Amino acid sequence: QPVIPVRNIYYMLTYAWGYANLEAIPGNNLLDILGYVLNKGVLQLSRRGLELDYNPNTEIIPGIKGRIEFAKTIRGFHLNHGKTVSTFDMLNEDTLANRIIKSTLAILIKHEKLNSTIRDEARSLYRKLPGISTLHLTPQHFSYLNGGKNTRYYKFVISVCKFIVNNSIPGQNKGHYRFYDFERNEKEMSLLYQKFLYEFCRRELTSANTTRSYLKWDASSISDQSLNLLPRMETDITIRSSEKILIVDAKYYKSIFSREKFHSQNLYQLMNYLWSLKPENGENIGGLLIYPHVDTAVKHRYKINGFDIGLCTVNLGQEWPCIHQELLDIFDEYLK
Amino acid sequence: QPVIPVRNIYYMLTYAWGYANLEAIPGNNLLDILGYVLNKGVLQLSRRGLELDYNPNTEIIPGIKGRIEFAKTIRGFHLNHGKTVSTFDMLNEDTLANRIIKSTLAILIKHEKLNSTIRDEARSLYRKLPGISTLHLTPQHFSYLNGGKNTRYYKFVISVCKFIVNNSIPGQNKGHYRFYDFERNEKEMSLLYQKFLYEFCRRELTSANTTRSYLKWDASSISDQSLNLLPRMETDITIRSSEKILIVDAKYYKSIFSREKFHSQNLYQLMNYLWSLKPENGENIGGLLIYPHVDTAVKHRYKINGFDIGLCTVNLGQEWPCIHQELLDIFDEYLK
């Protein structure tokens, strides 16, 4: 049952979310890492100042505040008991974004398997935010916040809040929670990998242009021009440069972690992407298969059907900088 | 949770094993069907006669039987107490094949969810075979019987015995057994489908020649001529005729059972099979995608990359003969 050290995933999640010292914490497991980011992350915000959104308030008060609503006043006859219905803007920190932080912290404490200090420190924070009201979180709450009015820093911790709630399962007790075994499932780990690269390549490969490209089948059918039944095909990433184009397909498989047979079923998808894609520039066409391995990294090249294709691996579990060096080394070879 | 009626699977299993009235039995579930085949199957054999294999026996007896072993006799001095060690051929029904039947019947009775009459009738049979010795079955036992000396009829019931043991799980009680929910898993149901067609096509399509064909990548690599890392590619079936060749890839998916998005990831495999395959005859090249659907069957044709390709379905759950008619109708269209 071999897996990646948990700390390294957080780095990939960071690029996945598109935006610190982790050596200090002694808990290798993820929630210890993830909570310490948040627990420190909240405190980092408070230094600068949390978001305060003017919420208009229409209420019945004994006097003039802001703009009086003449209609609701006369209709309810509130003048007679010395009151008016007036609209004014109380400034609160009770916004959806901040409510989510507080509700997330409640979930974090309730998790049964967690560092005690992490749980101790967070309980302070929950008390330190009296005005904010607890909420029962759903993805629909996060859906409303896709507008992204908030600052760039807020979006990072909220992304963490999205990860925690979805990857939280009740355990021994009804109240308490237990963390999901994220590493074991390939699909979510794989979907992380594909998104990890797409945002990563934009950062480092300033030389090349990095875009996801939709592809269209060359087919025509007398039955339907739509071709809906045909598989929808959208590249994982395309990283185009003037001298050479390159398509990459990346996936996480358990079989490859064992140093035997090889799982390369994804390759079957790849040629059709090369085929359906036709470049106006006509500089070259290349493909790449990249997978995660634990122990070591090996690079091969192939000349299959007039295409220059590479199968390669990365030794996750080594260290983040050499991994960062290794990736830049990787794309340097093929992007030429 | 829609699935195929259980009776129809037995027909596909029959072609899968390569070799009766099922209307009589009222139990729709599989083990009721499968046991009644076996329970009647054993009785069908006994009418003709069960296999009797001459087992040589070397034992210590008070007299001459067959060939006396002079050495073991003198070394043990058995002459003095009026005995000899002699080799002779007692004729038993205690062979591995027949032992498997009896052991299988014990498992069949122990299954908690089963028709009572089926369980009642089988318990008779277990008593009716006194000479045979019970055994604890493993696939390795079936492995030794791959020689297939036995008659053609024996191989059918033994194939059933292979299916039952593998698809048997202990349930409520330690002694009793509970049947596997075979339908729910796609892979074994899918692997049935691929094998179902390969043997089926040999039967009906006497006109065409039906063979599984291994394919080799057109690639060359400076690194290795072996290309071991590349995916191993072996067709599900190839059904070649003089006028036209045709490759088929068939798989069982749950998404397609819902009448939306379509799961055709297998198609990605298909083009590379067409590409890597080069016909000396050069008559034509065609491909087929065939899937199981429950309600209805729809056939489409495509002209993708110079290839004539069909995506089609079969309405399993209708009836076996029309299904048999439908398949012959299917291949008739494309094989042209």
Burial classification of residue A70, based on how many CB atoms lie within 10 Å of its CB (0-12 exposed, 13-18 middle, 19 or more buried): exposed
Helix (H) or strand (E) holding A189: helix A186-204
**Are A277 and A217 in contact, with CB atoms under 8 Å apart?**
no
Could you please report the per-residue DSSP string of B238-273?
EEE-SS-EEEEEE---SGGG-------THHHHHHHH
**Are A163 and A188 in contact, with CB atoms under 8 Å apart?**
no
Residue A196 one-letter amino acid: F
Half-sphere exposure of residue B170: CA atoms within 13 angstroms, side-chain side: 4
Which candidate, A51, A54, A56, places its Cα nearest to that of A91?
A54
Question: What 3-state class would DSSP assign to B192?
Answer: helix
Lookup result for tokens 């911790």: A157
Cβ within 8 Å of residue B276, ≥6 positions away: B215, B216, B217, B218, B233
**Are B8 and B320 in contact, with CB atoms under 8 Å apart?**
yes
Q: Which two tokens stand for residue B1?
A: 């949770």
Q: Between β-strands A245-250 and A237-240, what pairing exists: parallel, antiparallel or unpaired?
A: antiparallel
Closest CB from A217, A229, A271 relative to B300: A229
Lookup result for tokens 């604890």: B136
Q: Between β-strands A84-92 and A53-61, what pairing exists: parallel, antiparallel or unpaired?
A: antiparallel
Lookup result for tokens 């067709």: B235
Question: In degrees, to the nearest 5, what angle opens at C-alpha B266 toward C-alphas B18 and A230?
Answer: 125
Helix axes B6-17, B30-48, angle to 10 degrees: 50
Question: What 3-state class would DSSP assign to B322?
Answer: helix
Strands, DSSP E only, in B93-227?
168-169, 178-179, 209-211
Residue A288 and residue A302: Cα distance in Å, rounded? 10
Residue A289 and residue A308: Cα distance in Å, rounded? 11
Rg of chain B, C-alpha, whole Å: 26
Chain B environment of A301 (Cβ under 8 Å) = 221-223
Closest CB from B220, B230, B300 relative to A303: B220
**Count of C-beta atoms within a 10 Å radius of residue A269:** 19
Q: Which two tokens stand for residue B311?
A: 């995506």
User: From which experimental method does this structure derive?
Assistant: cryo-EM
Restricting to B residues 132-161, those with a Cβ less than 8 Å away from any Cβ of A are none
Restricting to B residues 9-68, those with a Cβ less than 8 Å away from any Cβ of A are none
The minimum CA-CA distance between B231 and chain A, rounded to whole Å, is: 6
**Are B279 and B290 in contact, with CB atoms under 8 Å apart?**
no
Q: Does B301 touch chain A (CB under 8 A)?
A: yes
Q: After which residues is chain B broken (C to N over 2.5 A)?
A: 19, 259
Which candidate, B214, B237, B329, places its Cα nearest to that of B288?
B237
Helix (H) or strand (E) holding B321: helix B320-335
Which candidate, B235, B178, B196, B193, places its Cα nearest to that of B212?
B235
Which candidate, A312, A273, A270, places its Cα nearest to that of A290?
A312
Question: What 3-state class would DSSP assign to B274?
Answer: helix
Helix axes A152-166, A30-48, angle to 10 degrees: 150
Which candidate, B111, B145, B130, places its Cα nearest to that of B27?
B111
Rounded to 5 degrees, φ, ψ at B210 are -120, 120
Strands, DSSP E only, in B62-140?
67-68, 84-92
Which candidate, A218, A274, A205, A204, places its Cα nearest to that of A246?
A274
Question: What 3-state class would DSSP assign to A84?
Answer: strand
Could you please report the per-residue DSSP string of B10-34?
HHHHHHHHT----SS----SHHHHH
Q: Between β-strands B285-293 and B245-250, what pairing exists: parallel, antiparallel or unpaired?
A: parallel
Burial classification of residue A334, based on how many CB atoms lie within 10 Å of its CB (0-12 exposed, 13-18 middle, 19 or more buried): buried
Give chain B's count of helices (H) and strands (E): 10, 11
Question: What 3-state class would DSSP assign to A145?
Answer: helix
Helix (H) or strand (E) holding B312: strand B308-315
Chain A environment of B301 (Cβ under 8 Å) = 221-223
Which candidate, A258, A189, A251, A184, places its Cα nearest to that of B265?
A251
Q: Does B92 touch chain A (CB under 8 A)?
A: no
**Are B126 and B68 in contact, with CB atoms under 8 Å apart?**
no
Residue B262 and residue B155: Cα distance in Å, rounded? 39
Helix (H) or strand (E) holding A86: strand A84-92
Q: Which two tokens stand for residue B172?
A: 């409520």
Chain B environment of A287 (Cβ under 8 Å) = none
Give the range of the structural domain holding residue B230, as residue numbers without chain letter: 185-336
Rounded to 5 degrees, φ, ψ at A304 are -100, -65
Lookup result for tokens 């016909």: B279
**Are B230 and A264 in contact, with CB atoms under 8 Å apart?**
yes
Question: What 3-state class would DSSP assign to B84?
Answer: strand
**Count of C-beta atoms within a 10 Å radius of residue A117:** 14
Which candidate, B278, B275, B315, B277, places its Cα nearest to that of B293?
B315
Are A218 and B311 in contact (CB < 8 Å)? no
Are B271 and A272 in contact (CB < 8 Å)? yes
Residue A142 and residue A100: Cα distance in Å, rounded? 9
Which candidate, A174, A162, A154, places its Cα nearest to that of A138?
A162
Closest CB from A228, A267, A301 relative to B231: A267
Q: Between β-strands B84-92 and B53-61, what pairing exists: parallel, antiparallel or unpaired?
A: antiparallel
**Are A136 and A110 in contact, with CB atoms under 8 Å apart?**
no
Restricting to B residues 226-245, those with a Cβ less than 8 Å away from any Cβ of A are 227-232
Q: Does A219 touch chain B (CB under 8 A)?
A: yes
**Count of C-beta atoms within a 10 Å radius of residue A266:** 18
Lookup result for tokens 């892979």: B187
Are B301 and A272 in contact (CB < 8 Å)? no
Closest CB from B220, B222, B262 relative to A229: B262
**Are B37 and B10 in contact, with CB atoms under 8 Å apart?**
yes
Residue B248 and residue B236: Cα distance in Å, rounded? 7
Residue B60 one-letter amino acid: I
**In angstroms, what CA-CA distances link B138 with A199, B75, B133, B163?**
52, 39, 15, 12
Are B303 and A275 in contact (CB < 8 Å)? no
Residue B99 one-letter amino acid: R
Q: Which two tokens stand for residue B308?
A: 């004539």
Lookup result for tokens 């591995």: B96
**Count of C-beta atoms within a 10 Å radius of residue A199:** 17
Which candidate, A311, A312, A247, places its Cα nearest to that of A276?
A247
Classify the C-alpha dihedral A111-A116-A121-A124 as positive or negative. positive
> How many angstroms is the resolution?
4.3
Q: Between β-strands B285-293 and B308-315, what pairing exists: parallel, antiparallel or unpaired?
A: parallel
Rounded to 5 degrees, φ, ψ at A94 are -85, 20
Q: Which two tokens stand for residue A142?
A: 């996060």
Chain B environment of A262 (Cβ under 8 Å) = 228-231
Strands, DSSP E only, in B22-158?
53-61, 67-68, 84-92
For an interface test with A, give the residue of B249, B268, B299 to mutate (most A CBs within 10 A): B268
Residue A45 and residue A93: Cα distance in Å, rounded? 13
Q: Which residue of B has its CA nearest to A262?
A: B229
The CA dihedral of A21, A163, A191, A244, to the nearest 10 degrees, is: -50
Burial classification of residue B306, based on how many CB atoms lie within 10 Å of its CB (0-12 exposed, 13-18 middle, 19 or more buried): exposed
Restricting to B residues 303-332, those with a Cβ less than 8 Å away from any Cβ of A are 303-305, 311
Q: Which two tokens stand for residue B204?
A: 């009906």
Q: Does B71 touch chain A (CB under 8 A)?
A: no
Residue A243 and residue A208: Cα distance in Å, rounded? 10
Q: Which residue of B has its CA nearest to A289?
A: B230
**Are A91 and A49 in contact, with CB atoms under 8 Å apart?**
no
Chain B environment of A228 (Cβ under 8 Å) = 262
Closest CB from B217, B222, B223 relative to A304: B217
Which candidate, A57, A55, A89, A84, places its Cα nearest to that of A71?
A84
